[PDB]
């Protein structure tokens, strides 16, 4: 009716990773200045405010933007530390140094945790 004549939306972009999905999923809110200070370093040309993981306005939104060693060490920790029959533990450790990708380590992780 006569409601959008005063409340200016400000297009907040909470990340609830590129700049496209941030602009795509970004609800517009009428933000209300309560504390003292200057909010001008945190808005952007176009009226958009990017929030942190602590709901903190950030100066530029680009602040908001695998491995095999860790994934093999953790599955060694799962084979070594869980209760398991000692032949089967040595068999799962045998076909783990022969791995060569992140895939087929995840097969052992779902092969060890499922027995």
């Amino acid at each position: 009716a006569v409601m959008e004549a005063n409340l200016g939306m400000m297009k907040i972009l909470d990340p609830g990773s590129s700049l496209s999905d941030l602009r795509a999923v970004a609800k517009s809110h009428p933000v209300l200045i309560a504390g003292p200070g200057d909010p001008s370093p945190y808005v952007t040309q176009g009226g958009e405010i990017a929030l942190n993981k602590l709901s903190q306005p950030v100066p530029h939104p680009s602040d908001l933007i695998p491995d095999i060693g860790i994934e093999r060490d953790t599955v060694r920790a799962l084979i070594l530390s869980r209760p398991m029959h000692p032949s089967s533990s040595s068999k799962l450790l045998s076909k783990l140094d022969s791995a060569g990708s992140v895939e087929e380590i995840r097969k052992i992780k779902r092969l060890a945790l499922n027995g």
């Binding site: 933000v31 209300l32 929030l51 306005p57 060693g69 860790i70 060490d73 530390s81 209760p83």
Partner: protein, 1309 residues
């Protein structure tokens, strides 16, 4: 002089490590600084050409020390100045042969101690175990191989890895403490000790210790509390090595710990001070190795992989990539392969590299980055949290006040749902709080809570520092370091700037006028308010008025509003937490709609919790509590004051680096400053934040449609999300429902904390089906998970600073060894370990002393019988063998004589010592000393130095007390009233010390003692009160020579005596006959021959004669005519590992109004006085005259309000709970103790059950049944005839002031 030998230097680290104290004393000598300190912000700005011309002794020692150190190094190369922690690995291997040969003199005597007394210790332990477990278990009484390794290697403390550096750093520490004591005296002695180590030297002064390596041409400098940090970490990691390599279930850890230590030492040479960003992750690797052992495939290895990724990410920024990979692989292989307890034991690796060097500028940057940040919170989520906040307030007020809502404004009750609950005064459900949140958040209250500003009174008596105001803030720093116009802005401070002393001296103190500092907004006009921040890694420093209002606000919230949210305290926290992990999956799996409830756990820690609260988030909650109190403006004060003020991180060696800073309102948001802070400070306003966190947790519970049992103490929050299942429901379905509930709740908790401005992580929070983490203890499947190595790291060798006290040092050793025995160790190992460590203690105090004993320190049977005789009788031993099984509730005198009788029987303690304790000459003795300390003997003894200094400061600080609150506390005749009351109570026909202790504690005399004992007598308070009034000559000579007088008094009384007047009782009678003989003989000059009675209780080990039944059953006692026993049963085939599908049901084992408290104490004194002496008119007149001192009741209201005459006159768990949650107790065939004694028997029985299963055992195999038979004991006595009489004499006057709310109740009840 002798006044300087009272408050000794601290022997252990109690303070942070300031970098610029060390760099002040480094620059003050002419040595080159480290190369990361060339462009330092404080070193390049101070005027050293005037500082070095002060010609104080503190600078002359440094200049002479630099001429000493520089002379030994060479000019052919570059002198390097390596700073901590880049010198961990070199000081790790420090090897002074002048201290090795000084500890080998102690080792040579401990080996003679073993080869003379180790076989009677075996005989003792086998004796007590054969008595408590019967002679049908006698083919299973062997000493543990922990005990046997302690028995073959007596010098466990001397022959480990890390022992040579432990020797060297303890000798350097004791030399530097001696030099500080010598430098207190104005003298001209050579205060420079040079030791020579393997390839280098060590230079010791009261301020620096310099270690020089001459082949590498390097040196390092260490400040006063940095050699304490090195000494503490050396004996800590050495004792961790000793305990982990002797204990059988820990021997795989020992090598691992050496690896995990030495590797990180090698990182400290090239990570530097950021190596403690690696050390901080070590805790995480102990929490992720427990989560490897999950019942499902979910949650397993999530936090482990997260910390391994964090360790890689911290290493790749500083190291090469290959070394980061190899170190990450090494950390991954150390923490892998562990058990459930062995993974929790790796929480000892926290304080084991020590602490970083702190500075104010980096701390202020870390605070400004998060406390001056902008925030954007959602208004609708504030309305949802406010809805649950106000609904929890309404339900809590309804529960407390018998079904009545708070006084709600009638025009603020919106809708038809809340207006219908208001008429019925019905309890609001959480679903109505979520549905009707727009109507429940908008509700207003009225003044319907009668608060009380001063309630606790112990929080106003704390030794908290007060910041001197913002026109004098440059008095925060050392005046030597300020600039020339910054020295002109420093004034003299007449105050002491302590909360205690400036609370006592502040007359015209009205609490309702001190709260007008906030309600009237006068804290915000006031231009003298300064806040100072402290160096840490929880503490600030406020001005006087603002600290008073903060203490009042915390007390008002914790007294009135905080129990509405339930807060969700030692036994009741191992019953609310040990029963909270009974809800886990593996606790009830043999059992597996709405029949049986299970839970899965979420331990969350919020990122930067206290300094992300804004005024915009907390305002409506503070508004609700202000409306509920009737206060215009009280509970939102911290954000409004910190927005309008500037604060600084205060440290005496960290001044402002700009020499032209004079006024705080003009300094930039820069160096040490936080200008217009918007967050909160930790500890301040904690109760409000905990309540808002509970409201958010219950909101996340209702938004995800589940029930939740939480527990939150700030940023540490523990949630059990619960789910009700069928017994015939499949275990896969139970695990699937728990995982879905935990996922839904955890998403909603993320969501409602992100919108009120907080961050708990998706990966750092530990979610688990099995365990949770409370007070840094891991609670896992109804059991507490072991931390023996943490307690081993604190098994240290000097305790306290108030004198050279050996008794208190051995007492700390005994308490730590008892805490080791509680975390699951063999009993014989802990008992002989305490003997050997107490011998190490008592030989470490004749040598290595920083301040006569030549006759008795070379006497091995004296040192044996002096460390093994109990402390109640004059020895050093604060660990009876009964304390290994249970708690010390009971009579200390009968336990003392029972241990002496056992030690005499097995051959440890000689026959002379028993008869010399029995024929011991009596002490001074008063009726007041018998009343204030019952269970006590009138033996000649020296008073403890801590008791004397504490009592002196309590008597000195209350001489200048002037505030109207607590005005009648310090009277001029309180000692005369105490002597008169004790002579009235005790000097009767029948002498009862315990009921007289109860009466005097319930009167105004014990109330004065209880109020004066609330003051915080720290070392600074004791220094202040000794400066304001000196101690004397006799008392101070007793403080200084306390240990020699204690030892020579043992030598004269009970070790070396003739005693031709042989006593009546012999050494073979029961120990309570012995303790009654010793009391009746010792108090005989005071008493005159009457029987001090009603005191003694039987020792629990001496009382019972246990028996474990055979396979067929039947006991050799009950075959001999015995019927009185307690029955203990343990079911067969109990798993102690994750395979809990066939375990018996687990339960919590056995552990142990509406008036003013003045009327409660008065009625308690009335009940005890009529119960103990008789029930007639003179006893009731005396009961009236004693109860009249605390309240204003008349004679007829005593007789219809006094209770019936009765016998009423996790931080540290009692034990691990592995097989004690399965034991069944029947105290049925024993009818004599159906009382304290059957509690002792039940606890002894549970400790004997769990003693049967060491930590290497995960499965039971048979059934165990105990009969604790106690019928044919020598220590069984029938209760005597209570003979009433009239109290001869008249009761003392017991005058009291009527204005005190803390000592008197003027209302006629």
């Amino acid at each position: 002089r002798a006044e300087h030998q009272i408050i000794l230097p601290e022997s252990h680290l109690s303070s942070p490590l300031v970098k610029h104290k060390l760099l002040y004393y480094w620059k003050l000598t002419g040595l080159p600084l480290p190369d990361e300190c060339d462009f330092d912000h404080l070193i390049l700005s101070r005027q050293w050409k005037k500082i070095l011309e002060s010609s104080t002794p503190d600078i002359e020692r440094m200049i002479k020390l630099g001429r000493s150190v520089h002379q030994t190094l060479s000019h052919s190369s570059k002198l390097t100045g390596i700073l901590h922690p880049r010198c961990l690995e070199d000081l790790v291997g420090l090897d002074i042969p002048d201290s090795t040969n000084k500890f080998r003199r102690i080792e040579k005597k401990i080996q003679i101690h073993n080869t003379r007394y180790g076989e009677p210790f075996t005989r003792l332990c086998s004796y007590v175990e054969k008595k408590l477990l019967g002679s049908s278990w006698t083919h299973k009484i062997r000493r543990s191989e922990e005990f046997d390794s302690l028995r073959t290697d007596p010098a466990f403390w001397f022959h480990s890895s890390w022992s040579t550096a432990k020797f060297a750093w303890l000798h350097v520490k004791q030399i530097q403490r001696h030099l500080i004591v010598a430098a207190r005296t104005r003298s001209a002695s050579n205060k420079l000790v040079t030791l020579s180590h393997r390839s280098g030297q060590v230079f010791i002064t009261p301020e620096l210790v310099i270690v020089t390596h001459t082949n590498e041409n390097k040196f390092t400098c260490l400040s006063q509390e940095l050699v304490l940090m090195y000494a503490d970490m050396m004996e800590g990691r050495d004792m961790v090595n000793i305990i982990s390599s002797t204990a059988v279930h820990l021997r795989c850890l020992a090598e691992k710990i050496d690896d995990i230590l030495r590797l990180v030492d090698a990182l400290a040479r090239d990570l530097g001070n950021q190596v403690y960003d690696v050390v901080a992750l070590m805790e995480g690797f102990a929490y992720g190795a427990v989560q490897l052992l999950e019942p499902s495939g979910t949650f397993a290895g999530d936090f482990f992989s997260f910390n391994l990724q964090e360790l890689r990410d911290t290493l790749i920024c500083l190291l090469p990539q290959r070394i980061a990979d190899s170190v990450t692989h090494a950390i991954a292989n150390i923490f892998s392969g562990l058990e459930q307890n062995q993974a929790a034991e790796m929480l000892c690796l926290l304080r084991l590299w020590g602490h970083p060097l702190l500075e104010s500028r980096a701390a202020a940057k870390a605070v400004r980055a998060q406390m001056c940040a902008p925030k954007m919170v959602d208004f609708d989520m504030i309305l949802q949290v406010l809805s649950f906040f106000k609904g929890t307030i309404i339900n809590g007020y309804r529960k407390k006040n018998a079904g009545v809502w708070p006084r709600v404004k009638a025009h603020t009750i919106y809708g038809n749902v809340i207006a219908q609950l208001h008429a019925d005064s019905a309890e609001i459900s959480h679903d109505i709080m979520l549905r009707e949140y727009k109507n429940l958040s908008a509700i207003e209250f009225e003044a319907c809570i009668e608060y009380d500003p001063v309630t606790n009174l112990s929080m106003f008596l704390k030794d908290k520092a007060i910041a001197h105001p913002r026109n004098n803030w440059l008095a925060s720093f050392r005046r030597n370091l300020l600039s020339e116009e910054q020295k002109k802005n420093v004034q003299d401070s007449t105050s002491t700037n302590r909360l205690l002393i400036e609370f006592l001296e502040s007359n015209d103190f009205d609490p309702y006028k001190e709260m007008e500092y906030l309600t009237t907004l006068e804290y915000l006009r006031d231009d003298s308010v300064a806040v100072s921040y402290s160096l840490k890694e929880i503490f600030a420093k406020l001005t006087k008025k603002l600290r008073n209002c903060q203490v009042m606000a915390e007390g008002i919230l914790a007294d009135q509003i905080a129990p509405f949210f339930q807060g969700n305290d030692s036994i009741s926290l191992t019953k609310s937490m040990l029963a909270m992990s009974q809800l886990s999956y593996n606790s009830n799996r043999k059992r597996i709609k709405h029949r049986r409830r299970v839970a899965t756990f979420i331990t969350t820690d919020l990122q930067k919790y206290c300094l992300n609260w804004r005024y915009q988030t907390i305002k409506l909650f503070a508004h609700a509590i202000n409306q509920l109190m009737g206060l215009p403006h009280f509970f939102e004060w911290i954000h409004l004051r910190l927005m309008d003020t500037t604060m600084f991180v205060g440290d005496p060696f960290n001044p402002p680096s700009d020499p032209t800073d004079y006024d705080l309102t003009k300094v930039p948001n820069d160096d040490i400053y936080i200008v217009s802070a918007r967050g909160g400070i930790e500890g301040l306003c904690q109760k409000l934040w905990t309540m808002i966190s509970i409201a958010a947790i219950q909101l996340a519970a209702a938004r995800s449609h589940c029930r939740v049992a939480c527990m939150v103490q700030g940023d540490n929050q523990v949630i059990a999300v619960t789910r009700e299942v069928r017994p015939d429901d499949s275990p896969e379905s139970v695990l699937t429902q728990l995982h879905e509930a935990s996922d839904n709740f955890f998403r909603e908790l993320i969501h409602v904390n992100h919108l009120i401005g907080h961050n708990l992580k998706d990966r750092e929070t530990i979610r688990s089906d099995t365990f949770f983490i409370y007070s840094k203890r891991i609670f896992k499947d109804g059991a507490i998970l072991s931390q023996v190595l943490k307690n081993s790291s604190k098994l240290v060798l000097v305790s306290g600073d108030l004198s050279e006290n050996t008794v208190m040092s051995c007492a700390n050793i005994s308490s730590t060894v008892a805490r080791l025995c509680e975390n699951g160790l063999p009993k014989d190992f802990c008992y002989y370990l305490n003997y050997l460590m107490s011998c190490i203690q008592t030989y470490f105090d004749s040598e290595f002393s920083i301040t006569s004993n030549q006759s008795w320190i070379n006497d091995i049977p004296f040192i044996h019988s002096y460390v093994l005789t109990p402390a109640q009788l004059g020895g050093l031993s604060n660990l009876q063998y009964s304390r290994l099984y249970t708690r010390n509730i009971g009579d200390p005198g009968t336990t003392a004589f029972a241990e002496v009788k056992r030690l005499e029987a097995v051959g440890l303690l000689g026959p002379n010592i028993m008869t010399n304790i029995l024929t011991r000459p009596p002490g001074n003795g008063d009726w007041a000393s018998l009343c204030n300390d019952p269970y006590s003997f009138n033996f000649e003894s020296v008073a403890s130095p801590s008791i004397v200094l504490k009592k002196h400061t309590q008597r000195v600080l209350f001489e200048t007390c002037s505030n109207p609150l607590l005005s009648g506390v310090h009277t001029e005749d309180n000692e005369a009233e105490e002597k008169a009351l004790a002579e009235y109570l005790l000097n009767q026909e029948v002498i009862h010390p315990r009921v007289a202790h109860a009466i005097m504690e319930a009167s105004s005399v014990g109330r004065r003692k209880q109020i004066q004992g609330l003051v915080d007598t720290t070392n600074t308070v004791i220094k202040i009160a000794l400066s304001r009034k000196p101690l004397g000559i006799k008392r101070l000579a007793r403080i200084i020579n306390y240990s020699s007088m204690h030892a020579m008094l043992f030598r004269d009384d009970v070790f070396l005596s003739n005693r031709a007047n042989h006593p009546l009782v012999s050494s073979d009678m029961c120990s309570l006959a012995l303790a009654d003989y010793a009391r009746n003989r010792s108090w005989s000059p005071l008493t005159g021959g009457r029987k001090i009675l009603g005191v003694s209780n039987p020792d629990t080990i001496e009382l019972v004669e246990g028996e474990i039944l055979s396979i067929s059953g039947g006991c050799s006692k009950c075959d001999s005519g015995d019927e009185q026993f307690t029955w203990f049963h343990l079911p067969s085939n109990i798993e102690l590992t994750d395979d809990t599908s066939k375990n018996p049901p687990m339960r919590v084992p056995y552990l142990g109004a509406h008036m003013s408290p003045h009327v409660k104490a008065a009625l308690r004194a009335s009940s005890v006085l009529i119960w103990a002496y008789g029930d007639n008119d003179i006893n009731w007149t005396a009961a009236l005259k004693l109860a009249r001192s605390r309240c204003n009741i008349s004679s007829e209201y005593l007789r219809l309000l006094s209770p019936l005459p009765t016998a009423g006159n996790t931080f540290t768990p009692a034990s691990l709970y592995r097989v004690s949650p399965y034991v069944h107790i029947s105290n049925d065939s024993q009818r004599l103790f159906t009382n304290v004694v059957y509690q002792q028997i039940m606890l002894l029985g549970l400790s004997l059950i769990e003693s049967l299963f060491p930590m290497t055992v995960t499965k039971t195999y048979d059934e165990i049944t105990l009969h604790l038979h106690s019928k044919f004991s020598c220590c069984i006595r029938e209760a005597p005839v209570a003979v009433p009489f009239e109290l001869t004499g008249v009761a003392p006057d017991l005058r009291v002031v009527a204005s005190n709310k803390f000592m008197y109740d003027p209302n006629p009840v």
